Amino acid sequence: ISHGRVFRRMGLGPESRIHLLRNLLTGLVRHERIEAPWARVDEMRGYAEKLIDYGKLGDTNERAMRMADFWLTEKDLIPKLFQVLAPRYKDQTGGYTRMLQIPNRSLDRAKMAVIEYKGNCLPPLPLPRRDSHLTLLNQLLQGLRQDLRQSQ
Partner 1 sequence: LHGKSGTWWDEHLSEENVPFIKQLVSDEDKAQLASKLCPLKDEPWPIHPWEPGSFRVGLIALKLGMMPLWTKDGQKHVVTLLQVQDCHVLKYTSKENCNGKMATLSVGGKTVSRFRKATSILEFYRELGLPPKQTVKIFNITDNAAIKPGTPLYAAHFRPGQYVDVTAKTIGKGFQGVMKRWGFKGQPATHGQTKTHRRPGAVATGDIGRVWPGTKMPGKMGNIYRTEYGLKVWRINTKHNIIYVNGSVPGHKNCLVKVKDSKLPAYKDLGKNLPFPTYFPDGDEEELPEDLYDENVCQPGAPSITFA
Partner 2 sequence: AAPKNRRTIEVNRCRRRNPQKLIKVKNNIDVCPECGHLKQKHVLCAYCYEKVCKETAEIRRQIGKQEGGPFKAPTIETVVLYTGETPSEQDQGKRIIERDRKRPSWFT
Partner 3 sequence: SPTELTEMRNDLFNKEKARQLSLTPRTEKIEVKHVGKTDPGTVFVMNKNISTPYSCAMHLSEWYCRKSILALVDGQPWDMYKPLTKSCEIKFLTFKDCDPGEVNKAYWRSCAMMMGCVIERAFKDEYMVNLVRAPEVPVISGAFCYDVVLDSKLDEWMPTKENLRSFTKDAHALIYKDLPFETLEVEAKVALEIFQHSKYKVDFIEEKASQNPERIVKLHRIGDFIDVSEGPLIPRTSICFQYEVSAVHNLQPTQPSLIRRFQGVSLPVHLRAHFTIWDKLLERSRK
User: Within positions 55 to 114, which residues make up the interface with partner 1, using CB under 8 A?
Assistant: none
CA angle 108, 111, 115 (to 5 degrees): 125
1 binds, among partner 3, RNA, partner 1, none (CB under 5 to 8 A by kind): partner 1
- 50 touching partner 2, by CB under 8 A: no
Contact 114, 35 (CB under 8 A): yes
- 79 touching partner 2, by CB under 8 A: yes
Residue whose CB is less far from partner 2, 94 or 103: 103
State how far the Cα of 32 lies from the Cα of 22, in Å rounded to an integer. 14
Q: Which residues on neighbouring strands pair with residue 112, listed in sequence order?
A: 37, 102
Helix axes 14-31, 38-57, angle to 10 degrees: 70
Which residues bind to RNA, rule: CB under 7 A? 11, 16, 19-20, 22-24, 26-27, 30-31, 33-37, 73-74, 107-108
- 4 touching partner 2, by CB under 8 A: no
